[PDB]
Every structure is written in C-alpha cells, then in structure tokens.
Short mmCIF file of C-alpha atoms and ligand atoms in Angstrom, two decimals:
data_model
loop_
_atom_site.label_atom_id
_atom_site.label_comp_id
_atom_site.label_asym_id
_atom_site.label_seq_id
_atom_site.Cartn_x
_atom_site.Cartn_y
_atom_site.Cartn_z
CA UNK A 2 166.23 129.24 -37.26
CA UNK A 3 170.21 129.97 -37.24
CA UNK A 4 171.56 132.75 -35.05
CA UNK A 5 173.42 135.38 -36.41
CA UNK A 6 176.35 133.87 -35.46
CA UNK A 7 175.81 131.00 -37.56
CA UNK A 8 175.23 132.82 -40.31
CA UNK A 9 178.47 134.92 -40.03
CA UNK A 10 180.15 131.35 -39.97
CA UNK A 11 178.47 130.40 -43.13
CA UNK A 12 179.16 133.79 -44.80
CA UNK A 13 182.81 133.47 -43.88
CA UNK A 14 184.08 130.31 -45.27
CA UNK A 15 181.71 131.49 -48.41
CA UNK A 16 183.60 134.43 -48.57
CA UNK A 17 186.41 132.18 -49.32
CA UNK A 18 184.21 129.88 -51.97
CA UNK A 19 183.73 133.30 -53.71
CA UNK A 20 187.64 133.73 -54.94
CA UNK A 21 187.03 131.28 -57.35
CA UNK A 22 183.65 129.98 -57.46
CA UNK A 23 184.37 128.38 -60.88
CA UNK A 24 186.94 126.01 -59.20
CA UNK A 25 184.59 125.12 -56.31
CA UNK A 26 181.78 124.29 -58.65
CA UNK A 27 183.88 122.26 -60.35
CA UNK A 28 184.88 120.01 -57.26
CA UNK A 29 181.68 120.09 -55.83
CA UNK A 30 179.91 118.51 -58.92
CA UNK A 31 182.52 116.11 -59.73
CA UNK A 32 182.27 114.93 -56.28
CA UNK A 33 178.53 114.50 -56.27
CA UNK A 34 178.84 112.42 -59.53
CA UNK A 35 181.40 110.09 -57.77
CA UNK A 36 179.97 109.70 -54.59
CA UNK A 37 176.42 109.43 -56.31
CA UNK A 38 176.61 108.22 -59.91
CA UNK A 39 172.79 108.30 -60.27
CA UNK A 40 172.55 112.00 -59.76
CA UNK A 41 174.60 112.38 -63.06
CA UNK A 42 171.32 110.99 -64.96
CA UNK A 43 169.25 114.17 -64.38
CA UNK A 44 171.55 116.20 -66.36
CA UNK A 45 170.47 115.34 -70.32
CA UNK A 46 173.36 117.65 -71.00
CA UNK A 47 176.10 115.94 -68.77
CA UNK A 48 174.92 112.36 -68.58
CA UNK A 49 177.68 111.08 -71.49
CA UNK A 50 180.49 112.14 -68.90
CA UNK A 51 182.49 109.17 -68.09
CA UNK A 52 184.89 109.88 -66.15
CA UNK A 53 186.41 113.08 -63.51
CA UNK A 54 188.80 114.45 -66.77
CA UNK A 55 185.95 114.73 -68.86
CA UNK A 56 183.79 116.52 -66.19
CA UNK A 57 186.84 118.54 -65.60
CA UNK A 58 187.35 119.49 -68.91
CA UNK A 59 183.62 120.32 -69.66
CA UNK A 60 182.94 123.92 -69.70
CA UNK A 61 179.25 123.75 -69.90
CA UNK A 62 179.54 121.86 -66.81
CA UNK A 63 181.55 124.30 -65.44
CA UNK A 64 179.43 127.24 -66.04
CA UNK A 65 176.44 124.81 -64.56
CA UNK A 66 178.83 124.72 -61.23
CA UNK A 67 178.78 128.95 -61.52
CA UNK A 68 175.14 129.17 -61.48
CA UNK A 69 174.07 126.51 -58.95
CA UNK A 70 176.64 127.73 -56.64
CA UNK A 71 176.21 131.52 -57.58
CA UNK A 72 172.53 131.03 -56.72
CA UNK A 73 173.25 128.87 -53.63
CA UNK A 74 175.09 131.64 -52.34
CA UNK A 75 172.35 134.65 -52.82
CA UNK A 76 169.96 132.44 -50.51
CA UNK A 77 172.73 131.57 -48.32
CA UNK A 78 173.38 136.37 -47.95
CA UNK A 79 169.33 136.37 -47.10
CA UNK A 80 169.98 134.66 -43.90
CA UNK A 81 166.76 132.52 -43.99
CA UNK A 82 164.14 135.42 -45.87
CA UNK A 83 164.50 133.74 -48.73
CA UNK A 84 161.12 133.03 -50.17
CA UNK A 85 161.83 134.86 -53.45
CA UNK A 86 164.63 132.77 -54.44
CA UNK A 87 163.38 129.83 -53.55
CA UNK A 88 160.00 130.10 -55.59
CA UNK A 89 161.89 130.13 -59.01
CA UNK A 90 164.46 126.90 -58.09
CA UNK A 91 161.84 125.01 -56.17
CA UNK A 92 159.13 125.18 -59.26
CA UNK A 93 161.98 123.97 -61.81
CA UNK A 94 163.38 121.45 -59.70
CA UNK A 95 160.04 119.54 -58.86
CA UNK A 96 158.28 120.28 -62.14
CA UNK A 97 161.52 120.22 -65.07
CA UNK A 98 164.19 118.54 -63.83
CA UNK A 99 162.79 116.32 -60.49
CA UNK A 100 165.31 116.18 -58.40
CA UNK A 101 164.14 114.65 -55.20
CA UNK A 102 165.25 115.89 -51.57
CA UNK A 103 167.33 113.07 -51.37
CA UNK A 104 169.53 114.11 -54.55
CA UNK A 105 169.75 117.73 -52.61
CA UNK A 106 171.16 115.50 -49.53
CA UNK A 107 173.69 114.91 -51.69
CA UNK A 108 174.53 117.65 -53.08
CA UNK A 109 174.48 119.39 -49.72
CA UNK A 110 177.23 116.22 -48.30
CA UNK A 111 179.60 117.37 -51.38
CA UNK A 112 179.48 121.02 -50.29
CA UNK A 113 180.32 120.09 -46.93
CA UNK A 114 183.22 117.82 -48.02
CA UNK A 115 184.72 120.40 -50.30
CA UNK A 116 184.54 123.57 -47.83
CA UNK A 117 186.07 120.53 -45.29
CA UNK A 118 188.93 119.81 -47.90
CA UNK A 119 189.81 123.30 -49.24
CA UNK A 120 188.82 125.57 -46.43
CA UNK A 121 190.00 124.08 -42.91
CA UNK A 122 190.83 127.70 -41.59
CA UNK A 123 187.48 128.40 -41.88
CA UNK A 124 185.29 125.09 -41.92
CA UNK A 125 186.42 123.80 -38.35
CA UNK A 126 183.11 121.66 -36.03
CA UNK A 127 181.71 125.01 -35.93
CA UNK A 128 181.21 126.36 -39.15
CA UNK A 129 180.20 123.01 -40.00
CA UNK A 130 177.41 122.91 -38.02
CA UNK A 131 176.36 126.15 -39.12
CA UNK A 132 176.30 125.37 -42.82
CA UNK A 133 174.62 122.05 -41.85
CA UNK A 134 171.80 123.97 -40.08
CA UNK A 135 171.78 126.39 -43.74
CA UNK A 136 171.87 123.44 -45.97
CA UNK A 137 168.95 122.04 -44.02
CA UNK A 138 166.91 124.98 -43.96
CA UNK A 139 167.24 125.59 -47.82
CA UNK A 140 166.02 121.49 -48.03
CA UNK A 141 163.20 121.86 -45.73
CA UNK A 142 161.99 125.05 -47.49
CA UNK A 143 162.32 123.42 -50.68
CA UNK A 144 160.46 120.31 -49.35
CA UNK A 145 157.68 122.95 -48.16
CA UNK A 146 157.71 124.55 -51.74
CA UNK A 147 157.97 121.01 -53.30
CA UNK A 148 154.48 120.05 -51.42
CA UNK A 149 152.61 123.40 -52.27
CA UNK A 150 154.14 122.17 -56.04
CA UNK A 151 152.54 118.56 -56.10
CA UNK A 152 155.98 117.10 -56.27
CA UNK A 153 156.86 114.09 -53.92
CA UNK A 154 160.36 114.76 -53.98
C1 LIG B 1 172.32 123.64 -53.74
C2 LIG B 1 171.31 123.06 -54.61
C3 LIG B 1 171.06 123.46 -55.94
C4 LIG B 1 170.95 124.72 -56.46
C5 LIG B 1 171.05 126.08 -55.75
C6 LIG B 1 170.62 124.53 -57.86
C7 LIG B 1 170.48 125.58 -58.75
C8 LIG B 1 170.23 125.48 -60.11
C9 LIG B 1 170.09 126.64 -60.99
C10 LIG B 1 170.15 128.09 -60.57
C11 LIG B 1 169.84 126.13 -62.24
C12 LIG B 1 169.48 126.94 -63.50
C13 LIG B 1 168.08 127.56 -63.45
C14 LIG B 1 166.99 126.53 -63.18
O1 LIG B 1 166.77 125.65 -64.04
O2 LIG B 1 166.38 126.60 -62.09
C15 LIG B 1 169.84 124.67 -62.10
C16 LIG B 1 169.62 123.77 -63.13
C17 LIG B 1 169.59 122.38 -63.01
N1 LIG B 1 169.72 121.70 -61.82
FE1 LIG B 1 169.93 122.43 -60.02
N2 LIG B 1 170.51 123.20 -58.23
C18 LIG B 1 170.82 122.52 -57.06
C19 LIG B 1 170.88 121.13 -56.96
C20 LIG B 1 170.62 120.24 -57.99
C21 LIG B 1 170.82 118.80 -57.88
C22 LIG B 1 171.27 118.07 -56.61
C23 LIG B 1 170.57 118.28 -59.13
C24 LIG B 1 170.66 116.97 -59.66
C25 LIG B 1 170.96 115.73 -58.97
C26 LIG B 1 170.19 119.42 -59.98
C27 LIG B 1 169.84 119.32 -61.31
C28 LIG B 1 169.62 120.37 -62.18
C29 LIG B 1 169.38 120.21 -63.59
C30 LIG B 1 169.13 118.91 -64.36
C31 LIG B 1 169.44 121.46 -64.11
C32 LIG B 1 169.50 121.80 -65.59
C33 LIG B 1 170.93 121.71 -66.12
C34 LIG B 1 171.04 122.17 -67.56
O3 LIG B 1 170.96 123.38 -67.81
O4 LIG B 1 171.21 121.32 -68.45
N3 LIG B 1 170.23 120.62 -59.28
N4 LIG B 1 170.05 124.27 -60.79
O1 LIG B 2 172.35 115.23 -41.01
C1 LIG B 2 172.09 113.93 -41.45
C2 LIG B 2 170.64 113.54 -41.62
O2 LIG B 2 170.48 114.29 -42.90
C3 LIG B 2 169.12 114.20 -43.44
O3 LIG B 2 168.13 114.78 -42.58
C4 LIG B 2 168.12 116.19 -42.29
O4 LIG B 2 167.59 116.84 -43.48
C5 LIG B 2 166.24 116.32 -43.84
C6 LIG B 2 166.13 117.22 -45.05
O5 LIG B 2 166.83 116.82 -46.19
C7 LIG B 2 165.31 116.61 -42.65
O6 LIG B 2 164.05 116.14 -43.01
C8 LIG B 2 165.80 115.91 -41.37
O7 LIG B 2 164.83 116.27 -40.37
C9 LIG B 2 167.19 116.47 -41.06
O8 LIG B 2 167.66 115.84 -39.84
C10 LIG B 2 168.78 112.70 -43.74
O9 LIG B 2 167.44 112.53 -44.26
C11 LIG B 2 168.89 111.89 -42.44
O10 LIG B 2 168.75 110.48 -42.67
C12 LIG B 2 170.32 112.06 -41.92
O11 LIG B 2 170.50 111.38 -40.72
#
C-alpha cells in the first residue's frame, strides 16, 4: 500500500507525461521493442516493424502508445481503488492478447527509463521508488485478476 506521499510523487512527474502523452508513448514503446524484441510479437498489427523509424513513423502505433498510457494513467489518479479498471485490461490481456507478467515487467522497466531520461526534475531516487511501488501494485493486481481469469501469466 503506497502513502499518500508516494502517490503525489507519482502524480507529479505524470503531470509532466501528460503535456504530450503522444510523445511519451512513443518512446516508451519503442524502447520496450528494443530492449525486448519478443514483446513486439504480441502485436499482429505492429509485428512487421523493423526498425525505431518505422515505429516512429507509425501512427497506429502511436495512437496504441495514447491508449495504453492514457489508461495507465486513470489507474495510476485512483491511488490503488482501482478494481474497475483493472477488470476490463486484466480479462483482455490474459484471455486476447496473453501477455504474461513478465512482458508487463517490461513494460513497467521502459516507463521507468523514460520518466528517468525526460523527467529528472521530477523522477529523482524518490519518485522512483514511488512509481516502482505503483507499477508493482498494478502487476500484482493484475496477477490476482490473471488467477481469478485461468491465465498463468
Ligand atoms: C502499463 C501496461 C499496459 C496497459 C495499461 C495496457 C493497456 C492497453 C489498452 C487500454 C489496450 C486497448 C484495450 C484492450 O484491448 O484492453 C491495449 C491493447 C493491447 N495491449 Fe496492452 N497494455 C499494457 C501493456 C501491454 C504489454 C506489455 C503488451 C505486450 C507485450 C500489451 C499488448 C497489447 C496488445 C497486443 C493489444 C492490442 C493492440 C492492437 O489494438 O492491435 N499490452 N493495452
Ligand atoms: O524490482 C525488481 C524485481 O522486479 C520483479 O518483481 C517485483 O514484481 C513482481 C511482479 O511483477 C513481484 O512478484 C515481486 O514480488 C516484486 O519484487 C521481478 O520479478 C524480480 O525478479 C525483480 O528482482
């Protein structure tokens, strides 16, 4: 459970994500399929991609970024009472598209590494460790969910 403190230091440095959460997305994705090339075979849609200009220049992929991170950022404003949101993303992620814990370990190190990159006035040890602990908590919910599901993960 994060204090409310924590929270504020997530909802800062999101604050920040939210001037242009196209461009974030972008980054954020693009690093995910670099760092973890096998996460880029879940997407039917952006599998072809070949290289960072072609993600870059994809605007479906873009508009994917907007609505993972626009989503990731209404659970992130419920401070942990997030059941609602999670029911939706949890069912479609285990059942649809399978995207194991593991892959959302991933995703979670390329948030991190972005905020780090673009954001140092407000990502500092800190508000690391604060979106760590959020990024965690979202995981083990969705674990929870993916159980209740049937899903491995
Ligand atoms: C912060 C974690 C994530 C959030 C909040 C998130 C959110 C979303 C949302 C809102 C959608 C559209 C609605 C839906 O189908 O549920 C979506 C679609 C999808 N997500 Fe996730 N996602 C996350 C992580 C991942 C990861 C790590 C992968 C893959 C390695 C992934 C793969 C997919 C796929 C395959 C789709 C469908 C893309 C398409 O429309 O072609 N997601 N995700
Ligand atoms: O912070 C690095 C560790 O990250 C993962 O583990 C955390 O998140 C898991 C959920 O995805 C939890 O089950 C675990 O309890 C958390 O510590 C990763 O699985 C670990 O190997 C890393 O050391």
């Amino acid at each position: 459970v994060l204090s409310e403190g924590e929270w504020q230091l997530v909802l800062h440095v999101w604050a920040k994500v939210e001037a242009d959460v196209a461009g974030h997305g972008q980054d954020i994705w693009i690093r995910l399929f670099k760092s973890h090339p096998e996460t880029l075979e879940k997407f039917d849609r952006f599998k072809h991609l070949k290289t960072e200009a072609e993600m870059k220049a994809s605007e479906d992929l873009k508009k994917h970024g907007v609505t993972v991170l626009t989503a990731l950022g209404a659970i992130l404003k419920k401070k942990g009472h997030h059941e609602a949101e999670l029911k939706p993303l949890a069912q479609s992620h285990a059942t649809k598209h399978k995207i194991p814990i593991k892959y959302l370990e991933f995703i979670s190190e390329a948030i991190i590494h972005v905020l780090h990159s673009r954001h140092p006035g407000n990502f500092g040890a800190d508000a690391q460790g604060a979106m760590n602990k959020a990024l965690e908590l979202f995981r083990k919910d969705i674990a929870a969910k993916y159980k209740e599901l049937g899903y491995q993960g």
